[PDB]
Amino acid sequence: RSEIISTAPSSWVVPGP
């Protein structure tokens, strides 16, 4: 067990259309 960091952006972005 160990706390690691991810810089990954979310693939989910709410549209504006």
Partner 1 sequence: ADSQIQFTRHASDVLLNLNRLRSRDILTDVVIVVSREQFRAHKTVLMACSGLFYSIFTDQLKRNLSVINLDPEINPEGFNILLDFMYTSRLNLREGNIMAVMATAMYLQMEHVVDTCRKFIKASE
- DSSP 8-state symbol, 17: -
The count of residues in the chain is 17
Q: Rounded to the nearest whole angstrom, what is the least distance from the CB of residue 17 to partner 1 in the complex?
A: 8
Site string for partner 1, 1-17 (x = CB under 8 A): xxxxxxxxxxxxxxxxx
Q: How many residues bind partner 1 (CB under 8 A)?
A: 17
User: Exposed/middle/buried for 2, CB within 10 Å: 0-12, 13-18, 19+?
Assistant: exposed
Least Cβ distance, residue 12 to partner 1 (angstroms): 5
Task: Give residues in contact with partner 1 (CB under 8 A).
Answer: 1-17
